[PDB]
Short mmCIF file of C-alpha atoms (C1' of nucleotides) and ligand atoms in Angstrom, two decimals:
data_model
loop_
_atom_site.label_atom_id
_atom_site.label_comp_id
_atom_site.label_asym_id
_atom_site.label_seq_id
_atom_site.Cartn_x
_atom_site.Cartn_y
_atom_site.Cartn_z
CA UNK A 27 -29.32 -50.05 -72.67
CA UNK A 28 -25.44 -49.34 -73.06
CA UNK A 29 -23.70 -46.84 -70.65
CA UNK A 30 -20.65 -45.13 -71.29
CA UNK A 31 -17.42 -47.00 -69.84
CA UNK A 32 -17.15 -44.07 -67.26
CA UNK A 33 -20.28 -45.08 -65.89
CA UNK A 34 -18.73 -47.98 -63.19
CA UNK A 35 -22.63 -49.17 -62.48
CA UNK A 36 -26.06 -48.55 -62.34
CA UNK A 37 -28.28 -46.20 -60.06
CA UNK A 38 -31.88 -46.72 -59.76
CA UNK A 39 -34.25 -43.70 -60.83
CA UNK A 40 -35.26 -42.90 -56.97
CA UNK A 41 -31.27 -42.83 -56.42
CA UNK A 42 -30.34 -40.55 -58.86
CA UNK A 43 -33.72 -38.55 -57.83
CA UNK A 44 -31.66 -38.06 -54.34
CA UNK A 45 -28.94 -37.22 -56.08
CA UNK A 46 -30.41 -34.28 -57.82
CA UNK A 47 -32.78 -33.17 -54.80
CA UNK A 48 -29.49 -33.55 -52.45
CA UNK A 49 -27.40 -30.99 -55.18
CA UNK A 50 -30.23 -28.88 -54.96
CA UNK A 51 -30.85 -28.71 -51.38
CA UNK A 52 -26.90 -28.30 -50.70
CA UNK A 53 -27.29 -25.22 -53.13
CA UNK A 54 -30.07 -23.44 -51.10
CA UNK A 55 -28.15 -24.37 -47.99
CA UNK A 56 -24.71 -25.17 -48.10
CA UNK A 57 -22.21 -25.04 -50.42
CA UNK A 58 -21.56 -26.67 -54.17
CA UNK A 59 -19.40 -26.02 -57.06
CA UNK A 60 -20.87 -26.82 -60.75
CA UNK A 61 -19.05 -27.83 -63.98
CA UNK A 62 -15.97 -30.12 -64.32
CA UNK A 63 -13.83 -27.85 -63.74
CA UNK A 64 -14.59 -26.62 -60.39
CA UNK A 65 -16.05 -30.43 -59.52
CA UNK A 66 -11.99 -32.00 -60.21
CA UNK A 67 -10.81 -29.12 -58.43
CA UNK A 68 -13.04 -29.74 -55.32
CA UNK A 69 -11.71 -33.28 -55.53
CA UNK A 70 -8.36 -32.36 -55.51
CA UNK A 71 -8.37 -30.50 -52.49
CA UNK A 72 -10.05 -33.08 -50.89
CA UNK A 73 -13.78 -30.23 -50.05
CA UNK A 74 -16.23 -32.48 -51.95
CA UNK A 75 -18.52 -35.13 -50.07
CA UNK A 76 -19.83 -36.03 -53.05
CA UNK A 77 -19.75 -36.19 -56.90
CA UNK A 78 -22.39 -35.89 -58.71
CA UNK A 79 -21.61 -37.44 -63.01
CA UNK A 80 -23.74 -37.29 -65.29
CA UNK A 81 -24.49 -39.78 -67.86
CA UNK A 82 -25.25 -38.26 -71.24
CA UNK A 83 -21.67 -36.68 -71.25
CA UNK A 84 -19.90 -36.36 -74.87
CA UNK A 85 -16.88 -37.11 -75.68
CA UNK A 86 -16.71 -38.70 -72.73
CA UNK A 87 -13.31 -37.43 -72.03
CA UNK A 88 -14.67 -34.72 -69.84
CA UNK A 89 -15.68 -36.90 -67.22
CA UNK A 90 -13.50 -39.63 -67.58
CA UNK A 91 -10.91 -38.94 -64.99
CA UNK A 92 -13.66 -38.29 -62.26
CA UNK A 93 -14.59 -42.31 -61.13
CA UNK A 94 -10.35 -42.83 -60.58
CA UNK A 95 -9.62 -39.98 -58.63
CA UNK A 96 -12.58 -40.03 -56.61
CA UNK A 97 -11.61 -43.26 -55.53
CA UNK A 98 -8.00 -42.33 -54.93
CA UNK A 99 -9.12 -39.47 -52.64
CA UNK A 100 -12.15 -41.74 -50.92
CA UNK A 101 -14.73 -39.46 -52.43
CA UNK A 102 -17.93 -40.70 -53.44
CA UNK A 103 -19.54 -40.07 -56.73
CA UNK A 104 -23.24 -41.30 -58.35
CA UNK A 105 -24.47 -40.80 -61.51
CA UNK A 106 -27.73 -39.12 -63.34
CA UNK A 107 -29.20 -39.49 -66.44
CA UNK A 108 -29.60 -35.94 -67.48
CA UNK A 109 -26.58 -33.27 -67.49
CA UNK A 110 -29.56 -30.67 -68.32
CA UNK A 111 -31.34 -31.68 -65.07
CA UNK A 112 -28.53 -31.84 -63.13
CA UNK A 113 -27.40 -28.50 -64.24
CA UNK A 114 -30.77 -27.19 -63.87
CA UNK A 115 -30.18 -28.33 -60.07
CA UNK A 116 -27.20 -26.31 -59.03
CA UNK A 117 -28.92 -23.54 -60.38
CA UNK A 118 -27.51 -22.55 -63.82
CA UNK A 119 -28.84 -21.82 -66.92
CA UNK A 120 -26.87 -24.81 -68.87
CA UNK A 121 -25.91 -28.22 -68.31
CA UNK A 122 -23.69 -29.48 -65.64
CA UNK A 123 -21.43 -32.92 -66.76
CA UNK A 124 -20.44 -33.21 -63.22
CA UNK A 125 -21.53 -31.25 -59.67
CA UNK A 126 -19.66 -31.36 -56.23
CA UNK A 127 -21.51 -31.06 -52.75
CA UNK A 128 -18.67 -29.19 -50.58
CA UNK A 129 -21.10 -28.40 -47.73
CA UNK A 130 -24.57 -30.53 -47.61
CA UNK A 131 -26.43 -28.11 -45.57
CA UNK A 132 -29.82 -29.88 -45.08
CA UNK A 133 -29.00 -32.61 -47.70
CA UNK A 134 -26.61 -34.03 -44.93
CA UNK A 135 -28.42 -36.80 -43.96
CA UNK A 136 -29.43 -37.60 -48.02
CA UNK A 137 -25.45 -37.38 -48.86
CA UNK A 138 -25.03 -40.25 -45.83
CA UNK A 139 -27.65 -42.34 -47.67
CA UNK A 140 -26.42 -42.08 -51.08
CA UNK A 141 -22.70 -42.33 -50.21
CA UNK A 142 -24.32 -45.80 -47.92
CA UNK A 143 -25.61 -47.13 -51.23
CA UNK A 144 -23.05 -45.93 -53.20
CA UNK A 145 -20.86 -47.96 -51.38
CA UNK A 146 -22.89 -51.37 -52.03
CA UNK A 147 -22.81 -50.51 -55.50
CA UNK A 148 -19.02 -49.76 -55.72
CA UNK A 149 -18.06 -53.81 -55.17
"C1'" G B 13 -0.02 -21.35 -68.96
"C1'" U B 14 -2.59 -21.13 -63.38
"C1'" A B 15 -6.47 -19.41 -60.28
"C1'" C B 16 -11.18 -17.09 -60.26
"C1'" U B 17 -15.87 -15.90 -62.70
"C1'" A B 18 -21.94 -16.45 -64.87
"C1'" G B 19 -22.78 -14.13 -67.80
"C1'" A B 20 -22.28 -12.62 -73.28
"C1'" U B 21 -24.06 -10.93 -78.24
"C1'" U B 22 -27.76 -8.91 -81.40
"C1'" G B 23 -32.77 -6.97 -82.10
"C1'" G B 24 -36.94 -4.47 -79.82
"C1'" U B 25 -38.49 -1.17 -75.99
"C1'" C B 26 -38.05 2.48 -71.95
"C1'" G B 27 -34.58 6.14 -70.41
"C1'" A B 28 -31.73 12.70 -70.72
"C1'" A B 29 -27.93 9.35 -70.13
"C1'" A B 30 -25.85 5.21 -67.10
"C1'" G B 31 -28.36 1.44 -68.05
"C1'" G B 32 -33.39 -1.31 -66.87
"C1'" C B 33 -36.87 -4.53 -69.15
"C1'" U B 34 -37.57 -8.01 -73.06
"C1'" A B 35 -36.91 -11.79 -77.26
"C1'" A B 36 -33.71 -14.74 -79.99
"C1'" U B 37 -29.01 -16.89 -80.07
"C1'" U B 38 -25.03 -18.36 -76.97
"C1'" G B 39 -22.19 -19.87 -72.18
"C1'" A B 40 -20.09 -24.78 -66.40
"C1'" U B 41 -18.06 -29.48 -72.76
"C1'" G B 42 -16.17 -22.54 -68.83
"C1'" A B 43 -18.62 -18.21 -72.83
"C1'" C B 44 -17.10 -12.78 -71.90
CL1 CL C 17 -29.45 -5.17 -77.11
#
RNA sequence: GUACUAGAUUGGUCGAAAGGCUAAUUGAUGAC
């Protein structure tokens, strides 16, 4: 398939399974913030410990700016397929284009792993 | 304009009301 040019590279399905079951877990035991909104803003001020994008976002402009500035700020980010599911796991009744983990809770050892392998994929 | 926020609308139903329940639509692409 084709990905949208904010997608920077490609996450296997049990990665982007993580992803979702870390945003999940950090929501029944730490701390996240949901939509794009609150996700740039927990970027900004340098809380998030990871960014979670999803891919089916359009116009793609919503998300766009995400991939830069997490990389200014150091902040990593990983992408899944579904902004329905990934809304769905921080607990709202919509989609989510984007998610931030600001506390992992008991997804701190899954936010290590991911932000390991995210790190392999970013070169 | 900035920050915050996860509700909102209509119909049905229950209720003495406040409102609860419920369905459809709608809301993190940020509704009210
Ligand atoms: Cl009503």
């Amino acid at each position: 398939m084709a990905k949208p040019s904010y997608v920077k590279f490609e996450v296997p399905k049990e990665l982007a399974e993580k992803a979702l079951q870390a945003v999940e877990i950090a929501r029944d035991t730490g701390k996240i913030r949901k939509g794009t909104n609150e996700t740039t803003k927990a970027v900004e001020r340098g809380q998030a410990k990871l960014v979670i994008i999803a891919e089916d976002v359009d116009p793609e402009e919503i998300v766009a700016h995400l991939p830069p500035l997490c990389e200014e700020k150091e902040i990593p980010y990983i992408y899944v397929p579904s902004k329905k599911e990934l809304g769905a796991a921080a607990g709202i009744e919509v989609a989510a284009a984007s998610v931030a983990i600001i506390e992992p809770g008991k997804a701190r050892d899954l936010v290590e792993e991911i932000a390991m392998k995210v790190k392999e994929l970013m070169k």
